[PDB]
Design an enzyme around this catalytic site. Structure first.
Site, mmCIF file in Angstrom:
data_model
loop_
_atom_site.group_PDB
_atom_site.id
_atom_site.type_symbol
_atom_site.label_atom_id
_atom_site.label_comp_id
_atom_site.label_asym_id
_atom_site.label_seq_id
_atom_site.Cartn_x
_atom_site.Cartn_y
_atom_site.Cartn_z
ATOM 1 N N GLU A 114 0.635 -0.825 -0.192
ATOM 2 C CA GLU A 114 -0.076 -0.060 0.000
ATOM 3 C C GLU A 114 0.357 1.315 0.324
ATOM 4 O O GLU A 114 1.787 1.444 -0.293
ATOM 5 C CB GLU A 114 -1.218 -0.096 1.048
ATOM 6 C CG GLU A 114 -1.774 -1.503 1.327
ATOM 7 C CD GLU A 114 -3.202 -1.177 2.616
ATOM 8 O OE1 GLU A 114 -2.563 -0.565 3.405
ATOM 9 O OE2 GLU A 114 -3.356 -1.633 2.568
ATOM 10 N N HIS A 122 4.692 1.001 2.295
ATOM 11 C CA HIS A 122 4.552 -0.463 2.995
ATOM 12 C C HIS A 122 4.167 -0.859 3.289
ATOM 13 O O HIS A 122 2.590 -1.550 2.165
ATOM 14 C CB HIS A 122 3.815 0.373 4.086
ATOM 15 C CG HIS A 122 2.883 0.831 4.099
ATOM 16 N ND1 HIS A 122 1.846 2.195 3.971
ATOM 17 C CD2 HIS A 122 1.551 0.156 4.908
ATOM 18 C CE1 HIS A 122 1.172 2.110 3.832
ATOM 19 N NE2 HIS A 122 0.282 0.510 4.439
ATOM 20 N N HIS A 124 1.444 -4.742 4.671
ATOM 21 C CA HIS A 124 0.961 -5.551 5.722
ATOM 22 C C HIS A 124 0.716 -6.927 5.291
ATOM 23 O O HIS A 124 0.994 -7.239 4.383
ATOM 24 C CB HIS A 124 -0.807 -5.315 5.409
ATOM 25 C CG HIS A 124 -0.507 -4.049 5.713
ATOM 26 N ND1 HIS A 124 -1.666 -3.253 6.713
ATOM 27 C CD2 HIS A 124 -1.122 -2.315 4.938
ATOM 28 C CE1 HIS A 124 -0.874 -1.565 7.392
ATOM 29 N NE2 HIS A 124 -1.379 -1.272 6.099
ATOM 30 N N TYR A 205 -11.666 -5.182 5.381
ATOM 31 C CA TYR A 205 -10.811 -3.984 5.121
ATOM 32 C C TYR A 205 -9.567 -4.000 4.022
ATOM 33 O O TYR A 205 -10.162 -3.094 2.593
ATOM 34 C CB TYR A 205 -9.709 -4.276 6.612
ATOM 35 C CG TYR A 205 -9.264 -2.543 6.364
ATOM 36 C CD1 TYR A 205 -9.439 -1.297 6.627
ATOM 37 C CD2 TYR A 205 -7.740 -3.069 6.432
ATOM 38 C CE1 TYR A 205 -9.155 -0.500 6.427
ATOM 39 C CE2 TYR A 205 -6.974 -2.314 6.871
ATOM 40 C CZ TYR A 205 -7.782 -0.944 6.499
ATOM 41 O OH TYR A 205 -6.760 0.157 6.847
HETATM 42 ZN ZN ZN Z 1 -2.197 0.070 4.688
#
Ligand code: ZN
Ligand code: NA
Ligand code: NA
Length: 248
Positions: A114, A122, A124, A205
């Protein structure tokens, strides 16, 4: 309702409530003796066979998930760096799995690159399984950060002196370029590892994010995702939103 969309939805739903760690792999800007080391200063393609294989997987994941109906003006340098980081992140995960003698098939994981409004690139990582327990979270973060800092210093394309490489290694460790999700706390107080629910966090999400298609990247957008079942990898943005819809 393609088989790919139905397949991904089913795979996530079965893991809806599986507890997993949440990590973020990142980097921060560094200047050493006037030398600028930015987020995309790690573009060496290291000729280690596994890393090469992982990087090819990222490339093909990007290629298959690309929506060619619309044009994509993401910088080539940006794509290159993201593919390289995908391979390095996964190398770190696999190195720690090896340390614990964990068979890769006994692990559920999900990776999503992202671009954050403030922090920029970064990655996840959700990861867990039967061989995982919450108390091990701090150890996992520390080990991942050791391998992450090691690989970043190896992949750095800025010409560095040995003293500068060691400084960069120290910075990436001391400033925790791998973070672990914890419950909110006080600076003095203890931090407790906060496990998340794998399928739910992905469907509700990570799969709701907007696809980056420009340089500079849209704030909060995603580049690329992948998982241990190769389920979400090739999905286009529209298909990802369908997965969320069906998951509900
Ligand atoms: Zn993020
Ligand atoms: Na590399
Ligand atoms: Na990925």
């Amino acid at each position: 309702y393609s088989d790919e969309v139905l397949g991904a939805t089913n795979w996530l739903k079965e893991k809806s409530n599986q507890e997993v760690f949440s990590f973020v792999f990142k980097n921060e800007n560094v200047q050493l003796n006037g030398k600028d080391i930015g987020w995309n200063s790690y573009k060496k393609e290291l000729q280690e066979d596994e890393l090469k294989s992982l990087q090819r997987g990222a490339e093909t994941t990007w290629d298959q998930s690309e929506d060619m109906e619309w044009e994509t003006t993401v910088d080539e340098m940006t794509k290159k760096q993201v593919f390289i980081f995908d391979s390095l992140v996964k190398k770190c995960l696999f190195e720690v799995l090896n340390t614990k003698n964990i068979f890769p098939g006994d692990v559920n994981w999900f990776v999503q690159h992202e671009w954050g409004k403030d922090q920029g690139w970064h990655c996840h990582v959700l990861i867990g399984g039967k061989d995982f327990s919450q108390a091990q979270g701090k150890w996992w973060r520390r080990q991942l950060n050791v391998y992450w800092s090691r690989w970043l210093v190896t992949a750095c394309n800025v010409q560095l002196t040995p003293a500068e490489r060691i400084k960069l290694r120290e910075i990436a460790e001391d400033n925790e370029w791998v973070t672990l999700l914890t419950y909110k706390h006080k600076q003095t107080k203890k931090d407790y590892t906060k496990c998340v629910l794998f399928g739910n966090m992905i469907a509700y999400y990570f799969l709701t994010k907007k696809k980056i298609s420009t340089s500079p990247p849209r704030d909060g957008g995603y580049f690329l995702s992948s998982d241990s079942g190769w389920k979400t990898n090739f999905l286009k943005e529209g298909e990802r939103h369908l997965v969320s819809k069906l998951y509900t």
